[PDB]
Ligand binder design. Structure first.
Ligand code: CLA
Ligand code: CLA
Ligand code: CLA
Ligand code: CLA
Ligand code: CLA
Ligand code: CLA
Ligand code: CLA
Ligand code: CLA
Ligand code: LMG
Ligand code: BCR
Ligand code: SF4
Ligand code: SF4
Lengths: 663, 131, 79, 119, 86, 73, 218
């Protein structure tokens, strides 16, 4: 016997699930594979950085954008596509000149702020980052060899006593050690990296931004505030001082755990054992979940503070950079946030040992004892938020459709206004006690209106429901009342049969699949809020309390330039935006059939098609189907493929709209 | 005699009661019994008798309860003085804004408040153990 | 270029293009040499990851292995 | 001129987006018919057996798959268990610890990992 | 091939055996219930995985449990008709 | 000598995977054969997802709880 | 039980045992499949029935014989026949070589009827919840198959779960002395039974040292 066509999907669904590998027999192999994969991924990141730097160096106009950044537009890379018109000139080129694309990433402001002035510096930087990619791959090879050499040194290893087998658990102490990793991460990788970047700023960035000054004196460490007037960005001296302070704090903190000597520092196990934790820190899924849950606030605050307090030169002067960066980082942090819950569920399925029935000692145990209370209260708050946001929006829509704008229910956002007032009083007290006052903070505090209150309630509803689905999946991954053996099965499995009431979407993976739709919807709400307030603050402040305003004055109204891109009147430089808009609509709708239509129909359809192929004159004498038997996609594969189509469509439909509306 | 289900359950209970006691001993050697795993470090028991042992406070395990109480109250006074003399009374912000420097004594002292909190925690832990 | 979007037309935003080349062919070739080095090393790394660790090397491979003196300390310092 | 980099594009773009992808797809469909294909996720491949046996040949990982591995002195454990069962043996029960454990280890699951018979 | 396991809670319904569409299950004598019989799954290589046996089992939680193994599918566990894997 | 709870006596279910875990149900009958592993038969007012309101439990999964009372499972 | 001599369906064209059936495209796909399942039965009257592969059929008053690609179709037809009070039907799997394997009434008694000599295959001696946790059996014989564990392993891991919750009374495993142990494997003292005595004395020394160290500030 052999396999069917579903082998490809089955293999690719766990192609990186190194725990599911067949040759892997021990944590040594798993940890070494993960470490080597980390090295390869770092190489990929470095090559990507070098790629962007090269294309800015070669197929771009950094040397000219740096001179007049406010009205100029950067170039991403050239367009070489043989499908364009070999005659005339495309709307993306100045007549006979080559074809170009406008960069919406923001690397131009990054390099300008960091101190780049010439193309030659960018070329040297590209070369150095390619060198670093080589170094990373060679480090991967080095560590593979060192661990294989330890394994070979077990050919000259014996304790002369039966305790020699204890060495089995310490072979991967290089990777699995936690105290040393925490100490050196928090100290070196955070604090000293910040201190080195402060040195970079003081040596290059501040010297290459103003007239020549003293030999990088300590007057380069200022405490001004935000939004230097000329470049509309944070003071580079303030940034250097901030990185210096963070570096000092994290360097001091990095001396906490017992890393290299047994006589200094406290152990993480003893820290947890005397607190409300003591979790299984040897689980890789648990660590991954709680560090993905750490990159999530970091990325969300990155999205918030790149816009609110623009740190790069002339970044606020670009109407497309500011929206694209915020939306990108919001989507990245939403993905990481749902990742944290997905891997928490995988941790509970795979890497969690629980007491017999009643020992309420582990934190997961105490959570599982009253998990029903958690889920019931999360459902209650989700229901309240949904009911009272949709109902008030419906009131506003109905009363404004009935020619009565004054009959709306507009709750003044008093709590957010109080927080803003307190923060503004603090900031104004800071500013008034300065001999160099009249500072600006850009959008750190923004006008808050009833529309803001309603949108914040909608966002809270989305977050609550996403957390509800993910938390329910995590807590009932090991067993629910409907299926009280769920931890005997895989993390993702089809169903439990039509009996016992019917059990579609019962696995924890199915809970993740359901929660990804809500993650996408909440992110869409957040992005729509930001983009609408960005396009017209006045119209958002007044007419955003009724959903018809969102439907008309934002979606229908702002989609005018994009659809007009390519038509029977000529093309604009938004032609790619409109074409990708339609393509992403097609991708989004194509995944509906993988979600709505389920397997058996298609399996019968595939049986009919296979009947045809085994009935066609020439095919039957070459291919009997016994080798790679065509079969319909399995249930979990179908749900995942539909989810991928839906996610791709929903995500990639937005950047064309952003570019058409802002540019 | 035939092995009734009650007899099988009795064997289950006997086996579990014996083995759960045996595995705690020095003769099972499971990876969950390593240092940094569930069991306490050899010479440093953290929790015994449902009370924080003296080894919790690390290098302060040899300190007396009276010494820790005095250090806790002294550090609380000094740190609270530093915080109040840095924030509200004798503000340093205007002085440092015009090119001056912080009163370094205030900065050093203000870090003694959380130190005092944990010092009084350690004082209570020492008092519980009779040290 | 034929601009699209209201703001580009109503503000006069323009996209300057350098009349020079950017990078000469020699610089591109210099980058491609190191890119090829990355490529060869990455193919080797992919092979090694695909095949995984070989534990049976101690029966055939020469030498006797080695544990660095710090790795021993890290082993006996704890976990 | 601002062009003259298109001399690189006219070779690289057709190459890496047509020749390399087609060669990769052909090589992948060829690899799909090897006996080693997807040996890490597909059960019953020869290389998986060789890797498992190679792991078992290592002196550290000989008794690694045994769930009961760890008992430093299994004879002491068995003797203590037998002594504890003797004082709790119900009346004239005829079951010993040795055969009880022997029959509790031997289950009947013929269709478990039967895919270890082709490669 | 899937994995069909029978647990001690079986009460000799024979409903699981009757519901199986590929004769995977059978009744064997036993002494752990008033019916003096428990189910067995000697031929799970023919178990398609329809889980009708689980639908038919009336114990509080199923005395018969079918564990799906998709990376394990054989021609019999897939119900292949147009194609032979032998 | 009768073994297990009396007939018609309410018992609280201690089987963790049972649909009626920590619920209560009347004892229909208790099988007196020592060879039967799950002799206690309990019927419930609330049916499970299989629309079955009765199940057989082990001797160590019923604790002889009082009557449910008003508005109590 | 005596297996019949069911010939290969490609060599028994026009047999008197074949019931009168309409014939459809649902039959087994020749030119691509060589494994066929055959079901035979003896009827009393020519009662019309439904073929599992579409189309109806009329049995013969004597012997009957049908060929199908899948065992499921044969079992479906067997249930349909048994509803008509037709017992004594046998289902055979035909190998490509022509080998006849007797499948459905394997011991001659239908599986819903208890027959002596059968043994509970794939039986587990506990409630379904009694299976060991998947997390406990990582990188063992049952890496992701906790439901396949033998009951002894389930009891062992249950006892381990019971033990590894009384943290204060656990025994921390001593750290190996890598630098001064670990000679060449040929450098061993043999004396295996003495090695356990060395284990006993070394662990006694470790425990005494730990007790002495603990009795300093505790
Ligand atoms: C927009 C979304 C979308 C799309 C594209 C399809 C497409 C299809 N559905 Mg479908 N379906 C959808 C949504 C969609 N469905 C939804 C929401 C449901 C609700 C459950 C269903 C329910 C459904 C059922 C129940 C059935 C179908 C069927 C079909 C197929 C018949 C049409 C066909 O063969 O045209 C061809 C497919 C196209 C997409 C046309 C465009 C093809 C492109 C434009 C040309 C080729 C591109 C080119 C080669 C690029 C190469 C790729 C690139 C990587 C190089 C087809 C694959 C039927 C079927 O399969 O019967 C034959 C069928 O029975 N669908
Ligand atoms: C028949 C449809 C078609 C096809 C086959 C292509 C093919 C191509 N286009 Mg393209 N394009 C099209 C229609 C099409 N275009 C239309 C209608 C527009 C809008 C006017 C564009 C706008 C456009 C732009 C703006 C650019 C391209 C580019 C490219 C090239 C990128 C290939 C690559 O890196 O793969 C990588 C493929 C993936 C990562 C997808 C993996 C899945 C490739 C030759 C790019 C280019 O010139 O590259 C040098 C580029 O910058 N195209
Ligand atoms: C066809 C393949 C292709 C490839 C390989 C690249 C490659 C690159 N583009 Mg690019 N681009 C392309 C097509 C492509 N482009 C097209 C058709 C457009 C018009 C919408 C753009 C618009 C664009 C902008 C606006 C920017 C880039 C930038 C970049 C650089 C960073 C990566 C990035 O942002 O990708 C982005 C890729 C896209 C926008 C389109 C590809 C979408 C893929 C097919 C779907 C997802 C693939 C999956 C995740 C893997 C890199 C040199 C950035 C830069 O700074 O360069 C110096 C930048 O600011 N590109
Ligand atoms: C898929 C991963 C991914 C990608 C493609 C990007 C892409 C980007 N990030 Mg980024 N980021 C990510 C994940 C990612 N981020 C995560 C997870 C974090 C949290 C640690 C951050 C934190 C972060 C910061 C703090 C900054 C960026 C910046 C940037 C931009 C320029 C970076 C650059 O080329 O420097 C070379 C670019 C749009 C920078 C930016 O906004 O530049 C305009 C910037 O300051 N990112
Ligand atoms: C006797 C009626 C009754 C009572 C006292 C409660 C009480 C409660 N429900 Mg509830 N519920 C009910 C009926 C009832 N429910 C019905 C019929 C449904 C089906 C739609 C629900 C669906 C439901 C959900 C989905 C949730 C609750 C929740 C809750 C709790 C928080 C309060 C809340 O969310 O209310 C809001 C209640 C609703 C949104 C449901 C609609 C209210 C119905 C229509 C009232 C019907 C009353 C009935 C007709 C009275 C007839 C009297 C007459 C015969 C004499 C609380 C214990 C939440 C929870 O567990 O958090 C702790 C929660 O998440 N309920
Ligand atoms: C317009 C689309 C839409 C709407 C209105 C809802 C509405 C709801 N979903 Mg839902 N959902 C949708 C699409 C939608 N979903 C899609 C496409 C998916 C992907 C499968 C999901 C997946 C999903 C999950 C997984 C969960 C929800 C939940 C909820 C409830 C959230 C609590 C709430 O706000 O109740 C307020 C009720 C309303 C606003 C409905 C209007 C009531 C009248 C008209 C007033 C609510 C009933 C959660 C839930 O049950 O919460 C308790 C939950 O767990 N949904
Ligand atoms: C599930 C309930 C719930 C949730 C999750 C939120 C969530 C949120 N509210 Mg909010 N709010 C609620 C109910 C809720 N609200 C109710 C019932 C009212 C009264 C109409 C308000 C009035 C309100 C205002 C005026 C503002 C917010 C704001 C906010 C946001 C900032 C957090 C904050 O300060 O909230 C405060 C925390 C709460 C309100 C929690 C109270 C939860 C209780 C249980 C709700 C029921 C209370 C009950 C009706 C009181 C009856 C009194 C009666 C006996 C006399 C956040 C998204 C701010 C915002 O978005 O500004 C941008 C803001 O300015 N809320
Ligand atoms: C703010 C929380 C906090 C708390 C409660 C403790 C508490 C403790 N630390 Mg600690 N530590 C902290 C922050 C903290 N530290 C930080 C931020 C660092 C980095 C500078 C350190 C670096 C550190 C070292 C290097 C050592 C301790 C040690 C100790 C223990 C002895 C206390 C002593 O002598 O200090 C007065 C005690 C349990 C000592 C100990 O017992 O280790 C075994 C020890 O060697 N800590
Ligand atoms: C813009 C892009 C963003 C959209 C991407 C979002 C997708 C969310 C990422 C979630 C991926 C993790 C989930 C996953 O891998 O498992 C989702 C499932 C997991 O696979 C399931 O695993 C289970 C064991 O855990 C069982 O073995 C099931 O049988 C098996 O289906 O994967 C598949 O089903 C993949 C099928 C489709 C494979 C397509 C190959 C992709 C090739 C193009 C690259
Ligand atoms: C000889 C010479 C030359 C030539 C050169 C060449 C021919 C080049 C080419 C080059 C090339 C053609 C390159 C390419 C590259 C590519 C790359 C660089 C990629 C990479 C990737 C990576 C790195 C990643 C990877 C991975 C994956 C994805 C899978 C998994 C694993 C890993 C992670 C590894 C000249 C005359 C000029 C000069 C002189 C010298
Ligand atoms: S249906 Fe369930 S309880 Fe009845 S005989 Fe089959 S396995 Fe046993
Ligand atoms: S899943 Fe279906 S084929 Fe398998 S044993 Fe149960 S009833 Fe029979």
């Amino acid at each position: 016997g052999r396999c069917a066509s579903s082998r490809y999907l089955q293999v690719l669904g766990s192609i990186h699930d190194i725990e599911c590998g067949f040759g892997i027999d021990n944590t040594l192999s798993l940890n070494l594979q993960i470490f080597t994969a980390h090295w390869g991924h770092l190489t990929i990141i470095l090559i990507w950085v070098s790629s962007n730097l090269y294309h800015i160096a070669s197929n771009a106009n950094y040397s000219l954008w740096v001179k007049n950044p406010i009205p100029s537009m950067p170039i991403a890379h050239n367009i070489w596509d043989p499908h364009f018109t070999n005659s005339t000139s495309t709307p993306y080129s100045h007549t006979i000149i080559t074809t170009i694309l406008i960069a919406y990433s923001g690397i131009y402001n990054q390099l300008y702020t960091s101190g780049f002035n010439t193309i030659n510096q960018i070329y040297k930087t590209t070369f150095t980052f390619s060198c670093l990619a080589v170094i990373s791959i060679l480090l991967a090879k080095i560590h593979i060899n060192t661990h294989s050499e330890l394994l070979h040194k077990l050919a000259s290893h014996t304790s002369q006593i039966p305790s020699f087998f204890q060495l089995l658990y310490f072979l991967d102490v290089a990777i699995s050690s936690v105290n040393i990793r925490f100490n050196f991460h928090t100290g070196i990788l955070v604090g000293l990296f910040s201190i080195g970047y402060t040195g970079h700023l003081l040596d290059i960035t501040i010297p290459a931004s103003r007239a020549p000054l003293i030999h990088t004196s300590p007057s380069y460490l200022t405490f001004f505030g935000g939004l230097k007037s000329n470049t509309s960005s944070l003071y580079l001296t303030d940034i250097a001082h901030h990185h210096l302070a963070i570096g000092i704090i994290s360097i001091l903190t990095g001396h906490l755990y017992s890393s290299f000597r047994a006589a200094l520092g406290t152990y993480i196990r003893d820290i947890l054992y005397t607190s409300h934790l003591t979790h299984s820190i040897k689980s890789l899924h648990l660590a991954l979940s709680l560090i993905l849950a750490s990159c999530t606030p970091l990325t969300s605050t990155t999205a918030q503070h790149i816009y609110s307090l623009t740190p790069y030169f002339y970044l606020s002067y670009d109407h497309i950079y500011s929206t694209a960066l915020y939306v990108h980082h919001s989507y990245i942090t939403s993905f990481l946030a749902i990742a944290s819950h997905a891997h928490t569920a995988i941790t509970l399925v795979r890497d969690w040992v629980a007491p017999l029935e009643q020992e309420s000692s582990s934190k997961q145990i105490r959570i599982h004892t009253h998990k029903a209370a958690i889920i019931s209260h999360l459902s209650w708050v989700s229901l309240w938020l949904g009911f009272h946001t949709l109902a008030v929006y419906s009131h506003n829509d109905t009363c404004i459709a009935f020619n009565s704008p004054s009959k709306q229910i507009l709750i003044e956002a008093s709590n957010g206004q109080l927080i803003q007032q307190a923060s503004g009083k603090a900031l104004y007290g800071t500013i008034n006690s300065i001999n160099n006052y009249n500072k600006s903070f850009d959008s750190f505090i923004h006008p808050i209106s009833p529309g803001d209150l309603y949108v914040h309630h909608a966002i809270a509803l989305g977050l609550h429901i996403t957390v509800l689905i993910l938390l329910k999946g995590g807590l009932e991954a090991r067993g629910s009342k409907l299926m009280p053996d769920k931890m005997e099965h895989s993390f993702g499995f089809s169903c439990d049969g039509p009996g016992r009431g019917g059990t579609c979407d019962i696995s924890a993976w199915d809970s993740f699949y359901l929660a990804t739709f809500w993650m996408l919807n909440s992110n869409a709400w957040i992005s729509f809020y930001f983009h609408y307030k960005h396009l017209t603050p006045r119209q958002f402040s007044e007419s955003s309390t009724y959903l018809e305003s969102w439907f008309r004055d934002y979606l229908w109204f702002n989609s005018t330039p994009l659809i007009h891109g390519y038509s029977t009147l000529g093309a604009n430089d938004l032609s790619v935006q409109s074409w990708s808009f339609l393509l992403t609509h097609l991708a989004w709708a194509s995944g509906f059939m993988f979600l709505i239509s389920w397997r058996g129909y298609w399996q019968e359809l595939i049986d009919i098609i296979l009947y045809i192929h085994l009935k066609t004159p020439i095919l039957i004498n070459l291919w009997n189907g016994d080798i790679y038997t065509p079969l319909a996609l399995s249930i979990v594969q179908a749900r995942f493929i539909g989810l991928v189509h839906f996610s791709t469509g929903l995500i990639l439909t937005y950047p064309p709209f952003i570019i058409g509306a802002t540019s | 005699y035939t092995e009734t289900v009650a007899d099988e359950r009795l064997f289950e209970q006997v086996y579990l009661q014996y083995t759960s006691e045996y595995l705690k001993g020095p003769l099972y050697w499971h990876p969950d019994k390593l240092q940094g795993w569930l069991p306490d470090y050899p010479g440093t028991p953290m929790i015994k008798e449902g009370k924080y042992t003296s080894h919790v406070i690390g290098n302060l395990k040899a300190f007396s309860s009276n010494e820790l109480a005095f250090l806790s109250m002294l550090f609380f006074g000094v740190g609270l003085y530093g915080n109040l003399q840095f924030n509200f009374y004798d503000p340093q912000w205007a002085k440092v804004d015009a090119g001056g420097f912080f009163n370094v004594s205030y900065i050093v002292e203000s870090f003694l408040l959380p130190i005092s909190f944990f010092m009084h925690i350690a004082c209570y832990i020492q008092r519980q153990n009779g040290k | 270029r034929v601009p699209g979007g209201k703001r580009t037309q109503e503000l006069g935003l323009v996209i300057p293009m350098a009349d020079e080349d950017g990078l000469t062919d020699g610089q591109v070739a210099g980058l491609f040499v190191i890119a090829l080095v990355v490529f060869i090393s990455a193919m080797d790394l992919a092979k090694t990851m695909y095949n995984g660790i070989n534990p049976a090397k101690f029966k055939t491979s020469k030498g006797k292995g080695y544990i660095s003196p710090l790795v021993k300390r890290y082993i006996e310092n704890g976990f | 001129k601002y062009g003259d980099q298109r001399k690189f594009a006219a070779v690289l773009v057709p190459l890496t987006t047509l020749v390399f992808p087609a060669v990769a797809m052909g090589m992948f469909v060829l690899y799909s018919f090897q006996e080693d294909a997807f040996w890490r996720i597909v059960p019953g491949t020869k290389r998986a057996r060789e890797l498992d046996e190679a792991w078992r040949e290592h002196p550290l990982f000989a008794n690694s798959k045994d769930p009961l591995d760890g008992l430093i002195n299994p004879d002491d454990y068995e003797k203590g268990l037998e002594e504890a069962w003797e004082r709790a043996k119900p009346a004239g029960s005829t079951v010993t610890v040795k055969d009880k454990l022997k029959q509790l280890s031997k289950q009947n699951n013929p269709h478990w990992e039967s895919w270890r018979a082709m490669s | 091939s899937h994995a069909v396991k029978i647990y001690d809670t079986c009460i000799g319904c024979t409903l699981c055996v009757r519901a199986c569409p590929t004769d995977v299950l059978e009744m064997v004598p036993a002494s752990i219930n008033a019916a003096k019989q428990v189910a067995s799954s000697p031929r799970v290589e023919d178990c398609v995985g329809c889980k009708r046996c689980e639908t038919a089992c009336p114990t509080d939680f199923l005395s018969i449990r079918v564990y799906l193994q998709d990376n394990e599918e054989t021609q019999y566990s897939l119900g292949l008709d147009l194609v032979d894997w032998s | 000598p009768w073994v297990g709870p009396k007939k018609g006596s309410w018992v609280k279910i201690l089987r963790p995977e049972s649909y009626w875990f920590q619920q209560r149900g009347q004892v229909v009958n208790v099988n007196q054969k020592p060879e039967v592993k799950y002799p206690v038969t309990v019927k419930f007012d609330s049916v499970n997802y299989a629309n079955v309101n009765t199940n057989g439990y082990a001797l160590w999964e019923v604790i002889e709880a009082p009557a449910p009372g008003p508005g109590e499972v | 039980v005596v297996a019949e001599a069911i010939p290969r369906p490609e060599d028994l064209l026009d047999s008197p045992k074949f019931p009168m059936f309409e014939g459809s495209t649902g039959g087994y796909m020749s030119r691509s499949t060589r494994e066929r399942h055959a079901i035979t039965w003896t009827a009393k009257g020519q009662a019309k029935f439904e073929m599992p592969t579409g189309g109806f059929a009329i049995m013969n008053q004597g012997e009957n014989l049908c060929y199908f690609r899948k065992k499921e179709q044969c079992i479906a037809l067997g249930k349909q026949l048994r509803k008509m009070k037709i017992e004594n039907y046998k289902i055979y799997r035909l190998k490509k070589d022509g080998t006849v394997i007797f499948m459905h009434p394997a011991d001659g008694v239908f599986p819903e009827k208890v027959n002596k000599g059968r043994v509970q295959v794939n039986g587990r001696p506990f409630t379904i919840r009694g299976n060991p946790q998947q997390s406990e059996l990582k990188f063992t014989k049952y890496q992701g198959k906790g439901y396949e564990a033998d009951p002894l392993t389930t009891m062992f891991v249950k006892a381990r779960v019971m033990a590894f919750a009384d943290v204060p009374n656990l025994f921390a495993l001593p750290q190996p002395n890598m630098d001064e142990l670990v000679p060449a494997e040929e450098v061993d003292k043999y004396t295996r039974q003495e090695y356990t005595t060395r284990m006993m004395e070394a662990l006694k020394r470790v425990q005494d040292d730990r007790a002495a160290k603990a009795a300093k500030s505790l």
